[PDB]
C-alpha cells in the first residue's frame, strides 16, 4: 504493498507526451482541439452554458510540462474530459464529434502500452 508509487514529472512527461503527440498528429481531426475554446470568436456563444469544465490539447500539454499531473490517470482523465465535452456539445453529424470519436480510438491504442510500461 500500500505504499503509493511516486511518479516523477519527467518520467510522466517522457511516457505520456508521445501519446499526446499522437493526438496532435491526427490532421484534420485534432485541429478543433488544439487550442482553448473561445466561444464568441468561434460563433458558438452557448458553449459554456453546456460545457462546464473546458479542456483542450494545449492545456494538457502545459499541464504535463509544468508537473501538474502526479499520476498517469490524472492525465487520462483530462484527455477523456476533452472527449466527453465534445461528445456532449456537438451534434453527431458534425466534424468535431466525428473527429473526437477518431481521437478517442487513437488515444485508446496509444495509452494502453504506456500504462503497462508505467506499472
Ligand atoms: C468546427 O470544425 C472544424 C473542423 C476542422 C477545422 C476547423 C473546425 N478549424 C477551426 C478549429 C477551431 C474550431 C473549434 C470548434 C468550433 C466549433 C465547435 C467546436 C469546436 N471545437 C471545440 C472542441 C469545441 C467544440 O466542442 N466544438 C480549423 C480547420 O479545421
Q: What is the CATH number of the domain that holds 74?
A: 1.20.920.10
How many domains does the chain fold into?
A: 1
Is the CB–ligand 1 distance for residue 43 below 6 Å?
A: no
Output DSSP code: residue 6.
Answer: P
Q: How many CA atoms lie within 13 A of 39 on its CB side?
A: 11
Q: 41 CA to middle of ligand 1, Å? A: 11
- DSSP for 76-118, written as a single string: HHHHHHHHHHHHHHS-TTSHHHHHHHHHHHHHHHHHHHHHHHH
Burial 28-53 (b: 16+ CB within 10 A, else e): ebbebbeeebeeeeeebeebeeebee
**Which region, left, alpha or beta, applies to residue 62 given φ > 0 means left and ψ of -120 to 50 means alpha?**
alpha
Residue corresponding to grid cell 456532449: 88
Containing domain of residue 88, as a range?
3-118
Is the CB–ligand 1 distance for residue 81 below 6 Å?
A: no
Output DSSP code: residue 30.
Answer: T
Instruction: Write down how long the chain is.
Output: 119
Nine cell digits for residue 115: 500504462
CA distance 42 to 54: 15
Please say whether the beta carbons of 83 and 56 come within 8 A: no
Asked if omega into 28 is within 30° of 0 (cis), the reply is yes
Q: 40 CA to middle of ligand 1, Å? A: 13
3-state secondary structure of 23: helix
Q: 96 CA to middle of ligand 1, Å? A: 6
Amino acid at each position: 504493498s500500500m505504499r503509493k508509487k511516486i511518479f516523477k514529472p519527467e518520467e510522466l512527461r517522457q511516457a505520456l507526451m508521445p501519446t499526446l503527440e499522437a493526438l496532435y498528429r491526427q490532421d484534420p481531426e485534432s485541429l478543433p482541439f488544439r487550442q482553448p475554446v473561445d466561444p464568441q470568436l468561434l460563433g458558438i456563444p452557448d458553449y459554456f452554458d453546456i460545457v462546464k469544465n473546458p479542456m483542450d490539447l494545449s492545456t494538457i500539454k502545459r499541464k504535463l510540462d509544468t508537473g501538474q499531473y502526479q499520476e498517469p490517470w490524472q492525465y487520462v482523465d483530462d484527455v477523456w474530459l476533452m472527449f466527453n465535452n465534445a461528445w456532449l456539445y456537438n451534434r453527431k453529424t458534425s466534424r468535431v464529434y466525428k473527429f473526437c470519436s477518431k481521437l478517442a480510438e487513437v488515444f485508446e491504442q496509444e495509452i494502453d502500452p504506456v500504462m503497462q510500461s508505467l506499472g
